[model samples]
Target: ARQVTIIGAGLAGTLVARLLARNGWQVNLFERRPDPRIETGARGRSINLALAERGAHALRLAGLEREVLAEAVMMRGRMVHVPGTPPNLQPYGRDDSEVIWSINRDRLNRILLDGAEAAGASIHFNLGLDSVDFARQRLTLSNVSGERLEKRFHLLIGADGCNSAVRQAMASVVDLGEHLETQPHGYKELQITPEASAQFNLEPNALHIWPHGDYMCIALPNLDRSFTVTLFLHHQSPAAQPASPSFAQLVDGHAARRFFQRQFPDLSPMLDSLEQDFEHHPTGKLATLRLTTWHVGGQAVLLGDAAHPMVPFHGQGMNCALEDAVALAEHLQSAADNASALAAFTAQRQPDALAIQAMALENYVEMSSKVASPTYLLERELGQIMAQRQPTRFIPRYSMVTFSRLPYAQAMARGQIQEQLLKFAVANHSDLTSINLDAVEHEVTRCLPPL
Candidate 1:
């Protein structure tokens, strides 16, 4: 019997442990932090994520969907919040029913943690990875008390995070082509202080976006009647006026208040004490991480943010992370041993992860700047018409990217082709607004459907 060791007791690690343990493998799971369920409270949120159908499918397959969804709030689309403007609703899909469930990351982690434990996997908390002896197939991790311990296993999987210690260990042996750089921008979390009786301030089911050119603020609803708001802004460069405004400067400044009052007036009241949140909390950096290989030899593998850390614009980090877990587990099940499975896992997923990482970078423009463009609006309308007209042939790029499990690289390739064709039509047609869309749609069907 082979024993498996999983690093990082986050969602990915937990799911991987459950999947392997259920298959009758002995599993040991490690986490750097104490049990989140014991430490986390409702108001103490950390990046509540959008769990779409793709991720939901995995949770369902693992039999945790019902329990997880019990604490989720469904968000159907982006609620665009412009300064001094009414919030505009942009459906993720043309159909009203299409939705992405806003999941409390902490709660979801707790659920997965319990699931893994229940499946008979031994989970160790506050065990941080310090070193790995790949040739010996062993791991060195520091415990909560700061004492180091060693564990030997037949297999190892790193689900640790964007800057994984496990990854650092493997880099010593392989030229993983790994490079990480933080963006000029960073993000902070804010609370949408709700009414006392648990009443939500805005529509409880929409993802609210307040895009202000170079900066943006977004809110995702929670089951607790409040929405978790995230502010993405650029701190001054390392060399700046007064060494880049302090966290307090960024939050309490006239600019922060002005942006809220003008662009998101509805949010102003909810943030009566923005100063406390600004001063007391930490600012999170946004970064892009690229890695050439996900595994070294065959004894170790990295998945999710550990392998490809993308900015949050695409709302696909956790979703893609979950997909990676499922895919890796499937690979393991089909392979003879840890080494063979690790190689196949990297071979199968590196391209897919790279494609999504790139798209996530591209999405920063789409979310913050491109949404306000007239040309984008035109293309969106055209895309909707095309999808309706040729359901099989011309699926909108958004649909192809979001609804389908197409490889990220393939999605990008096909999307570029579709964009070129649609833009060409938009350039020539002046009466696009009132054209016989049915006839136009038929014409597109003749040469569409890139799959």
Candidate 2:
């Protein structure tokens, strides 16, 4: 039988191990973290996931979509809240037929790892990869007990995360053309407990957004009636050159509470333990990772965050990684040699990786600043109107990214055309009244082909 070694038993790593093992390949997965099934020592930087079509389809391929959805909460749209005003529910799709699911990271990892074990893959937790010898096709790992073990593999796969040891090792011997760009803004997670009677504190069917310029806070619902709220802000403040709210200003729990009370009065009433939550939860930084190469001559390949990781603005990091797992497994199984499999995987998947990364960055601006702008809001409405008029040709970019499994590269390209068309059509009219719908239809017909 064929054999493969994978590093990191996280979402991508575990899922791919299961897929390969089920395909009759002997799989070995090593993870530095302890088994999530036994202990979840509180999460870090795990913003609740917004599971879109691409992520759902990957689960379908693994025969776990239905089972996983049972534990997820469906979010229909975004509930945009501007202080002192009632929340505006912006539907994600035309109707309820198009929606996304919010899943907890810990639970999902347990589900995927359970499947991996059942599929006959050997999993070794707390055994961290120490080094990789690309020349010899061997790797060394150490366990918590201070014992070191060496392993050899026909193929090595790195489903490890953003700080992947495997990717670093490959870069040591080969030129992977690695580049990393860090974002100026960072995030801190807080919790919104349910009401006294265990009812949801906010509209549970919609993802909540408190949009402001340069910084924003969003809340994703949980099955337990709670909300995971994340505050995104500038990482520093230069000693009041201008009095701005940033991570630096909010140094303590009381400081954060004061900032929230000032900026978001409505949300303040809902966060029962705002100070405590802010103090306990860790503040995480965001970055975009890009690499021109994802493999080393068939001896090893990197997948998921190991290959490409983006900021969570678009909420597709996990979904994109899940798609990577399926694509990589399919290539490995079908190609004649390991080198051929990796080359094909990179050729087919790299474009989508870059596309999603670009869109994710664009979304950060849209979520934090653009939602509150009159021009952006009007254009968004016009895009929806045009989508109804020409459903096949003028689909909204949001629908393409969240509702369909269209290759991300195509989505990015097509979405750009629709965005420009909407801007042009809405430029003359402030509202729907007096808008030139006929001209817009002709423009759509000329610029876009039917999906």
Candidate 3:
């Protein structure tokens, strides 16, 4: 029997373990921290993730899709935040059929972890992987006690995270060519507290986005009436400024008062916990981790955040990771040996990973500032009309990426090309009041492939 040692017991690692176990591999998983159910995670850590159709599909294949869906709250496109303008609803697809689901991350993780354990995989907690010896297929690890130990396995896979200790350890002995860069922006979490007398603070089914050019705040509704509000701001913004020594003083600040009165008036009283959350919450570094090589001759392999870490703008990171686990597991099941399976997995997954990473980078612009522009909104309207008029010829690229099975990375590339063609075609046309819809459709289609 093939013995696989999996590092990191998060979503990726847990899913991979379950997949391998089902394939008859004896999997041993390692987690650096104790089980979260026994010891609850810190407050203000991302309580939930915005999972879309892509992620839902991947989950379906893994046999846990239905259970996940039961716990998810569907969000159809963005509830755009405008200063003077009333909130506008932009549906993700042609109608309510295609919508993203907001799921509690910790809950999802627990499900995956429990499912993996039930599948005959042994999970060890508070054990950190210290180093990987690829040539001999042995992993060096240390428990909560400082003592180091080594174990031999048939395959070693790292799902440790963006700053993977496994990746760092492997690079010490081999060339991983990992490129990790942090963007100049950071996100802080704020809660949209519910009204004392009634229910939710906002629409419970929509992702609320407050876009203000340099900075934006987004809220994904939780199972509870309260919304998990996140503010993505420049590193040097006033909100990013350090809080005062006293927690009470933080709530009394001019910035807090001004932010509440201006942007989030309804959430002013709820701002009572804002200072405590802000002062205590971690400022997660957002980045893309690109690794040229995913495996070392079948001795070890990397998946999920360890291999390709994209910004959360596209809401496809976890989906892509789950998809990776499925693809890799299939490859492993089909290959004659561990080495062959590892090679096949890398070759098949690399293109898709790179594509999604690029697309995710582009989505930041769309979310942070693009939605605010009049031209963008106008063109978006035109695109929708054209798509509705000519369904076969004018499928919106975003729809293809999010709603369809088309590979995400390639979809992004196609989207970039389509956007350029669209802007030029619309710019030259003077008739906005009474335009020929058919001609608009024809010109845009002419620029791309035969469709």
Candidate 4:
């Protein structure tokens, strides 16, 4: 087989390139940025990622899981910080086995890129994809010196991120059914350094969350004994004016300091340079992008964030993107040609992408507000009980998504059914101890099928 061209050397691009190269496919990878290995340039925005089973499986396929884990910190659950009260540990699963890992984005990208090159893929750095001519099987790429080059290809894959030029180029030829929606909320990053003793100031093994009503702040631990904190808040108010609790209102350093002081007293003190970080860090907008069609026959295809961009609430953005690479690689290996491979990939992954997109949006509500609700807590407790009683049939939705290889659409559909049952069982009861376990078991046996 002839060599294929892959655009964007980010997570998915590098991974798929490595997978294909290892299987003896000639792979030519193009990256817009200077080789991360040689440059200390700032990555656009550093968003710490949460890695679960889906992402781990993808890395294992490339033999880099153990290497990745070496630099990652385990987060057992959310350490919820409520005002005037002690922090609470809301366990993510039954035990430590279901925990997720917090890894730096740039670090992961660097590791994946190195793996791709080591596996015999040719990687081009500082080369931007200007456009693609699908009909003629050609690509236009520009470099740091503002010179452009065109090349012929057997297949072209767009693994570029949200702003994929390849996806833009493909739109000129095909109807991709593209839609983009920006959330009102935006986020600004902050940091919590270790104490004088070089140890974590708070619990190091949990994802810390300060859940205020409409806005919230979350912190994920880094391997260096520090935490990367992010504040998610509204950019505008209902009246189209800046709201009191929004990012706009906190532009002033003092205002941000006081806001944290009043709303997140316990954690605010830990941020010694709150004002400096607030002013220095850029506020990033959140959005969801979905494409009904992700490929233009065998000529070209889009994967990862290039295909589906989801909110970061559920921490599945990176995980789902990595999973895309694995699925696409599997299809490519067995298909007769590039066109057939791309078609099969889209048909199988589209529903799962949409399912996770919707779930991620819903999780924003859960993380920011629902976790604090007494009713929501009761339902979760009841769900856990059901999971324990019927281990085969009753698994929590979160567990199904994070801990298993179950198809996302099936997991989501079954989760809705499970939610309804839990709500009904807990509606009349004020606490978990008061709920009727016998009735819960009977309902699960009738409603859910064994996995």
Comparison by lDDT, 2 against 3, better one: 2
Indicate whether candidate 1 or candidate 3 has the larger lDDT: 1
TM, every model: 0.91, 0.96, 0.90, 0.96
Q: Measure candidate 3: CA RMSD.
A: 3.8
Model 3, residue 353: distance off in Å is 2.0
CA lDDT, candidate 2, residue 117:
94
Q: What is the TM-score (0 to 1) of candidate 2?
A: 0.96
What lDDT tens digits, residue by residue, belong to model 4 across residues 1-451?
5577999999999999999999888999998888867866564545568899999999998899998988888988879987666889887777768889999887899899889989899999889999888788888899978799989988888999989998999999999998897888898888887671144259888898888878999998887667889889998766654455887778677999999888887878788778998998789889998899999988889999999988888888789888999999999988998789999999999999999999998888888898778999888877887888899888988888898778889999999999899888888788678888899899899989998
Stretches of model 3 off by over 4 angstroms after superposition: 39-46, 196-201, 237-254, 263-270, 429-431, 434-436, 443-451
Task: Give all candidate RMSDs, comma-separated.
Answer: 3.1, 2.0, 3.8, 2.0
Weakest lDDT window of 10 consecutive positions for candidate 2: 192-201
The 0-to-1 C-alpha lDDT of every candidate, in the order given, reads: 0.79, 0.87, 0.76, 0.87
**How many steric overlaps are in each model, in order?**
4, 0, 1, 1
Query: Positional deviation of 98 in candidate 2, in angstroms?
Result: 1.1
The positional error of residue 160 in candidate 2, measured at the CA in angstroms, is 0.9
